[PDB]
Amino acid sequence: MPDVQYPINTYGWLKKAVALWADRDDDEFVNQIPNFINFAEKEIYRNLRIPPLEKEVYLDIKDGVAYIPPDYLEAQWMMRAKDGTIFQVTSPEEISYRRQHGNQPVNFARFGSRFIFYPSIEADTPYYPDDGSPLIPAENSVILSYYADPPEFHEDTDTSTILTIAPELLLYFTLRHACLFVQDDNGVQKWSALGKAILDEMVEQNKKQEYSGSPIAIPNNMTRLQSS
Amino acid sequence: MPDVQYPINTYGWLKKAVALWADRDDDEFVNQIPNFINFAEKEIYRNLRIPPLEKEVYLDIKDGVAYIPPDYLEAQWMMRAKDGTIFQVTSPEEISYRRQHGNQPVNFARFGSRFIFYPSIEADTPYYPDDGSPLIPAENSVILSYYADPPEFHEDTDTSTILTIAPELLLYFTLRHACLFVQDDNGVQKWSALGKAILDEMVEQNKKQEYSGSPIAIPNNMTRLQS
């Protein structure tokens, strides 16, 4: 019934293309298209890991109590902004052992909703109500890179990189839940297969993107640097 | 009687041919041909890697840092304008150990959206002037060859290398999504099989032009300067 333009750029046109690609369109159906899209995006971001949904940010360690941000889903490289240094993640028992038994390497763990560090780190960041003030990040400022949970659509004008990069993915993953809402199985299976194929293509692209500029050959690393 | 031309080379003729091979002439279907072609081109370029869609560009290294272009999909050989010195990709945990424990090989990583070179190389961009003058490349330059993503058509007269090389590819891959829109399964299967065969032929062609014209024996002896 409804019309739509060639590019599905925004939520407003996606919620109409959904009803178009499925003639099952009416009052009792269009009102829940938002819920189907919500379920589809949740099913997507639950396991999708790609750059465009990443986010880098400084942390405040406070030697221990340091807390995990709300948007934490998976941690990428973690380091500082001074001469470079990469942390490695270990288990709580290793850190508890390091505490008593005893600074080039630095470890960390995940205690519930915290990030513990064996050394008494003193990373500094501006407080909450600070107005602007980039602060010219001081030293001992760790920078964390992780995968952040993207926002949920709340306005027809609201767009997202997924719409501009792969709208068919959302359209199929939401037609799945649509054909589930109504009684239909063939469409469910076909849309699920197509969405899974698109997601596989995207993750394979991400894979072929990483470490894709030259071959590798470990040069028999046996710690040439031992003197220190 | 939508009539298309023999040398399918544009977006309008491709649209008309898609509407022809799907004889239905209705606004409900014609108005979405652009969406189908969009889905097809986003399905092809998302994993297609071939020379013609590559691109070369000079970086602007300030101090062992950089920024990836907004049209980056995959990187291949990088080097400098002089002497070669191909760079080799590494990981953060190694390009950060080199600094601590470290004639001069080069390494680079990807910190989200920034290439990080260890030696702290310096690069410069060429002369920008558009007054019908050459770019006059700059000294101490670094060249990068990546698989650039092509732009959306958004126009009838627009074209692409694919329309000239393999228009059947996009035709079948968009008729796939068309026959998905309307509940037609056998057509979906046929079009998908044909598109897959075409893509297989293309990737095989790209492989038979590689480092083939030579024996695979006598492994190279790039050992060292110490004989």
């Binding site: 990069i165 | 907004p70 049209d71």
Partner: peptide, 25 residues
């Protein structure tokens, strides 16, 4: 705009807000 390029943009997060513990501190 990017067609399939993943670096052509970066969608924001829910919100750059801390936990209640940081506000209390």
């Amino acid at each position: 705009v990017n067609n399939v390029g993943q670096f052509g943009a970066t969608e924001g997060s829910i919100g750059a807000y801390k936990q209640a513990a940081e506000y209390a501190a």
